[PDB]
Amino acid sequence: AQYEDGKQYTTLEKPVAGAPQVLEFFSFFCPHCYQFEEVLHISDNVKKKLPEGVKMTKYHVNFMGGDLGKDLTQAWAVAMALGVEDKVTVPLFEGVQKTQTIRSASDIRDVFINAGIKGEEYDAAWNSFVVKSLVAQQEKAAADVQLRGVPAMFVNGKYQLNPQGMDTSNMDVFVQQYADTVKYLSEK
């Protein structure tokens, strides 16, 4: 066929019931994730091709960056609860990987403050039980697919995107191919 298991995607021998439709994992420590966010706009280009009624979910993971990596998962939980994913994603990627000014939870907080989230609002979010369970959903979803690498994408808890099997000579082509695959898997 044109789309084949093991080529543009793999299938989970252990499907995950009740999974979000399009589920994406990343880490602010993850160099390809940096590329996926700032250079390729993968998440974006996927959305643009997904049908209507598809909701898109993105989660952060713990297994990179040790203590900071967990802080970041909690921080991303804050961003989700406050709905400010789009104002903190870039300064977080760049603070971790570009400028290396993020070394502690406090520096993570600074990104939020600079992006205009109130201190009061951040610290209450950070410490809230709504963020604790948001943290738990993130960890659970990663756990459910035995996630050992990022970036990672899953469609309907049964398919996992396989970017290795896509041509990378042209960035725009990689992106359209990646996205089209998601759409195919979506309709499967």
Yes or no: say if 57 and 22 are a contact pair by the CB < 8 Å rule. yes
Yes or no: say if 50 and 56 are a contact pair by the CB < 8 Å rule. yes
Q: How far is the C-alpha of 168 from the C-alpha of 178, rounded, in Å?
A: 11
The architecture CATH gives domain 1-188 = 3-Layer(aba) Sandwich (3.40)
Q: How many other C-beta atoms lie within 10 A of the C-beta of residue 96? A: 24
| Cβ-defined contacts of 39-45 (< 8 Å, 24+) | 39/171, 40/171, 40/174, 40/175, 41/175, 42/151, 42/175, 42/178, 42/179, 45/175, 45/176, 45/178, 45/179
Sequence-distant (6+) residues with CB within 8 A of 107 are 95, 101
Give residue numbers after which the chain breaks (C–N above 2.5 Å).
Answer: none
DSSP secondary structure, the chain, as one string? --S-BTTTEEE-SS--TT--SEEEEE-TT-HHHHIIIIIS-HHHHHHTTS-TT--EEEEE-SSSSHHHHHHHHHHHHHHHHHT-HHHHHHHHHIIIIIS----SHHHHHHHHHHTT--HHHHHHHHH-HHHHHHHHHHHHHHHHTT---SSEEEETTTEEE-GGGS--SSHHHHHHHHHHHHHHHHH-
Q: How far is the C-alpha of 13 from the C-alpha of 96, rounded, in Å?
A: 35
